[PDB]
Ligand binder design. Sequence first.
Ligand SMILES: Nc1ccn([C@H]2C[C@H](O)[C@@H](COP(=O)(O)OP(=O)(O)OP(=O)(O)O)O2)c(=O)n1
Ligand SMILES: [Ca+2]
Ligand SMILES: [Ca+2]
Length: 342
Amino acid sequence: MIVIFVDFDYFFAQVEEVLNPQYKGKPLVVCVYSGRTKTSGAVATANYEARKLGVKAGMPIIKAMQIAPSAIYVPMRKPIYEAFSNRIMNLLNKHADKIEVASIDEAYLDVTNKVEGNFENGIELARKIKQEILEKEKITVTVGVAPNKILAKIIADKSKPNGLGVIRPTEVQDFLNELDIDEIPGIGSVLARRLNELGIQKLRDILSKNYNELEKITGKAKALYLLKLAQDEYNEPIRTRVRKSIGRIVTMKRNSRNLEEIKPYLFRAIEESYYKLDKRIPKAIHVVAVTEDLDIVSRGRTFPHGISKETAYSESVKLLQKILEEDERKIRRIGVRFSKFI
DNA sequence: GGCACTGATCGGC
DNA sequence: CGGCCGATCAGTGCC
Ligand SMILES: Nc1ccn([C@H]2C[C@H](O)[C@@H](COP(=O)(O)OP(=O)(O)OP(=O)(O)O)O2)c(=O)n1
Ligand SMILES: [Ca+2]
Ligand SMILES: [Ca+2]
């Protein structure tokens, strides 16, 4: 297998730079304004100039503004980013035997047959891909080329920004022998340190432990994954991804535990959700509340039949009542998630 | 036991 | 201090 992984650089901010090139080369922060105050919200992403000043995705807008007050702060325009994404994925698709769109800004291509199993031709294809995306959309991307998805991602991550990372079939074992634990996709900061605390600093160190031992430290899924990766026995296929849930969640103007105050927000979320569902009919509904202290509480139900929009309204209220019954905290955000489509 | 399914949390992008 | 989403996993019912 020859895999090409593509990950768009500083995606949302970069699109904003394409639409407003005056922003380029200066700190730019794309913000998710919740509307509760002039500046309440979180950072979706920042360009590299803003990152140099300490701005990070997920950080409160007010905190970004504290450390980089002269950056340009713009509101997230997600539909435009989706459009860019859709066009790019369409360009990628024509170069691939198979494509896996993993998120709004990354995809895996299986180009094995496209390049006659010739790994070097795979690299050339990767260069052509980067060139085309740059020419056609003025977007820089980072690419990784490797025998499997996971190494393709790791080497891309190591080559950002605007990179072209490569791991040849012959380099894989050396590469896996030297890889740091915190460089592994799917191993978050906390767990990394926990493993680190137990003397697991490098991927190869996993081989020292056995499954029952590691499960206690990582959980089943993460244990099986790590033991496989460490042995270069990861080889998962490129698969067409299918949307499994669709939802909407909004910040209320003020916190509340007043049913009549919350309902309008919840019903708008349902309405916008059903618009997005289009012809998909969900059998499961979950109501999700972000509480005063930014904890998240969910109550849901699966039905033996598809849920009409009208049944979603009435059942959502019963779920909201359940949350209010079982959690005394005030609610800040309220929303809904639909899944199990017919 | 272990399969099928569930509701709820977790955490990455 | 946003707004999403898929993965994960412990609990139940069952044969
Ligand atoms: N907490 C986050 C993280 C990311 N995103 C969105 C904005 C990002 O641009 C996009 C892609 O996420 P990445 O992790 O790939 O990061 P970037 O593309 O922004 O930067 P990088 O160049 O490091 O890949 O997802 C978001 O809305 N909220
Ligand atoms: Ca990405
Ligand atoms: Ca990216």
